[PDB]
């Protein structure tokens, strides 16, 4: 049946909550029908989309509007919500119905007179009828029933009002707020909407995220409203929390320019990080004398380490395990060593213990990650005991990333002399508690510590991120070797020194950046933001306004 | 002074909001961001008062 189009004007407002408020002006953000939205009229069973919620209105009676269907592509594979208006009551059921929308025989049976379902048992709700009639022509002539159907989070909500209107083949003028009719806590997915005519017409609109200013009277009811997104005047009324605006100029908002597109630039690095050489080294140093390896001028895939089996722990400090893949770094170090396995928590950046204090200490900030895995095999050989543990340093709290293998005598204070017993000679401890394939602390957890320098210096390690071209002379969202921001990129014409990568202004903020592939210098100019004010003669004079940017 | 305060880093890992957000996940960034918000709000309130 054919469509037609009209305008909502004022319709679609409802009480957003269950709170009594009187003689107040309350600003609320919810799904509402825009005051002047384009409403589609349908002749009176088409299937319409269901978005955030649906506005429905009609003057037809229950012998024409027998209910509604809400759900996803209707089949036995998905639950649908069936709302039927009977002569004496309303019946609402949720189930994997293929049909169940008949109960009215005439001529159309091709897609009807079928009752195939599954284990319904879902919110089989029965109550008073949603559609009430009037005393014929003794009313206002054609009662306009307004409904709002929402599906938000664990709820399907219905708001409505009967409010009889004067006869018209269009939507009426004037203000009326809808009240909650029923609230059904149904976990249903709704993407489509269909009316039940079992075959004059009806109106359908759609709700959008809007902020409305609602005016309540002394009796706690809504008598008016303002749509904040309608025009500059409504915006002014809303910012001033008033339905009346005095002559003058008001500051209501802030102008912004969107970049619409992004730019990603990296140096052409075709090398890959030697991670196999670290994690699959097969030869790991003791914590006493840990092995320090450096990584540079290559691409670092960390996802392959994080999203990987056989690791026991993967703890990142100062960075997320799922973000480091998109960051650029300089001088990445991989400290490779073996510990007893109950010392894993003792190599954290801020913890104490014989390892933290004597064998291997990290900085207090330490941006990086500690990665370790079982690897009980090979290392914990039966009869094999190969893990030097540094215990005696005379002092304590050695130093971040310092390796002390001096093997001096820990004079116990017993005497300022050389010797063995009472002298605690031999700084490392030879009683290695390997406990081959048994107990706890039997030397699981080969450890690799990744230390990163998050410097302004040219990246030496980049993630597997693909670059784009440049746009220039437009507001863009850019990323230059991890340096991000929004602005307009233009030729700087600045004489950068051969070693400089970017420039800064008097405020010490980024002013210009060198492109990693072309080595050209681009200025970064912030996009316009300004501010927005509205000029009005006053609402007691006219509703015409001027806008200043 | 008002501008320079933007680079103060009021106990956060970085004075740059983008560097915090690009590095930390939601539940971690919120903490670092809140530190900057408090410091910047206090700095702005000081400016206005003066």
């Amino acid at each position: 049946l054919p469509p037609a189009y009209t305008n909502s004007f004022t319709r679609g407002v409802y009480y957003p909550d269950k709170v009594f408020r009187s003689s107040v002006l309350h600003s609320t953000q919810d799904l509402f029908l825009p005051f002047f939205s384009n409403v589609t009229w349908f002749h009176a069973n088409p299937v319409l989309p269901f978005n955030d919620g649906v506005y429905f209105a009609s003057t037809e009676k229950s012998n024409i509007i027998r209910g509604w269907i809400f759900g996803t592509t209707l089949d036995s594979k998905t639950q649908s919500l069936l709302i039927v208006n009977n002569a004496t009551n309303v019946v609402i059921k949720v189930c994997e119905f293929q049909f169940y929308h008949k109960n009215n025989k005439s001529w159309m049976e091709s897609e009807f007179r079928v009752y195939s379902s599954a284990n319904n048992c879902t919110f089989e709700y029965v109550s008073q009828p949603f559609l009430m009639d009037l005393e014929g022509k003794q009313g206002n002539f054609k009662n306009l029933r307004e409904f709002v159907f929402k599906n938000i989070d664990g709820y399907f909500k219905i708001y409505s009002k009967h409010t009889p209107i004067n006869l018209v083949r269009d939507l009426p003028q004037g203000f009326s707020a809808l009240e909650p009719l029923v609230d059904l806590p149904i976990g249903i997915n709704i993407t489509r909407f269909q009316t039940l005519l079992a075959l004059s017409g009806y109106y359908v609109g759609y709700l959008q995220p809007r902020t409305f200013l609602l005016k309540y009277n002394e009796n706690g009811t809504i008598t008016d409203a303002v749509d904040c997104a309608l025009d500059p005047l409504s915006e002014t009324k809303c910012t001033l929390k008033s339905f009346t605006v005095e002559k003058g100029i008001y500051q209501t908002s802030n102008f912004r320019v969107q970049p619409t597109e992004s730019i990603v630039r990296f140096p052409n690095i075709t090398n890959l990080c030697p991670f196999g050489e670290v994690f699959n080294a097969t030869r790991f140093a003791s914590v006493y004398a840990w092995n320090r390896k450096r990584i540079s001028n290559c691409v670092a895939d960390y996802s392959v380490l994080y999203n990987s089996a056989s690791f026991s722990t993967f703890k990142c400090y100062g960075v997320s395990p799922t973000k480091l893949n998109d960051l650029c770094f300089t001088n990445v170090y991989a400290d490779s060593f073996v510990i007893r396995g109950d010392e894993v928590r003792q190599i954290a950046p801020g913890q104490t213990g014989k390892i933290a204090d004597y064998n291997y200490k990290l900085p207090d900030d330490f941006t990086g990650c500690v990665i370790a895995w079982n690897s009980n095999n090979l290392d914990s050989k039966v009869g094999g005991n190969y893990n030097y543990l540094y215990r005696l340093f005379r002092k304590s709290n050695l130093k971040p990333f310092e390796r002390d293998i001096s093997t001096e005598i820990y004079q116990a204070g017993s005497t300022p002399c050389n010797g063995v017993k009472g002298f605690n000679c031999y700084f490392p401890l030879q009683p290695y508690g390997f406990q081959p394939t048994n107990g706890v602390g039997y030397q699981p957890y080969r450890v690799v510590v990744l230390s990163f320098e998050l410097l302004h210096a040219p990246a030496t390690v980049c993630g597997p991120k693909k670059s784009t071209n440049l746009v220039k002379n437009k507001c863009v969202n850019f990323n230059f070797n991890g340096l991000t921001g929004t602005g307009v990129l233009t030729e700087s014409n600045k004489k950068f020194l051969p070693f400089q990568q970017f420039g800064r202004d008097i405020a010490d903020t980024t002013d210009a950046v060198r492109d990693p592939q072309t080595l050209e210098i681009l200025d970064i100019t912030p996009c316009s933001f300004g501010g927005v004010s509205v000029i009005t003669p006053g609402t007691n004079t006219s509703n015409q306004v001027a806008v200043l940017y | 002074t008002l501008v320079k305060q933007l680079s103060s880093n009021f106990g956060a890992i970085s004075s740059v909001l983008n560097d915090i957000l690009s590095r930390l996940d939601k539940p971690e960034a919120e903490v670092q961001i809140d530190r900057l918000i408090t410091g910047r709000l206090q700095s702005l309130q000081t400016y206005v008062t003066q």
């Binding site: 202004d505 405020a507 903020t509 912030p526 300004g530 501010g531 | 008002l2 501008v3 933007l6």
Partner: peptide, 24 residues
Amino acid sequence: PSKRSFIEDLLFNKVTKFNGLTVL
């Protein structure tokens, strides 16, 4: 047609890139 008398010119001659900051 910018004057500002001689003395005023002396006064004007003698006396002498944003993030959310504007000047009206």
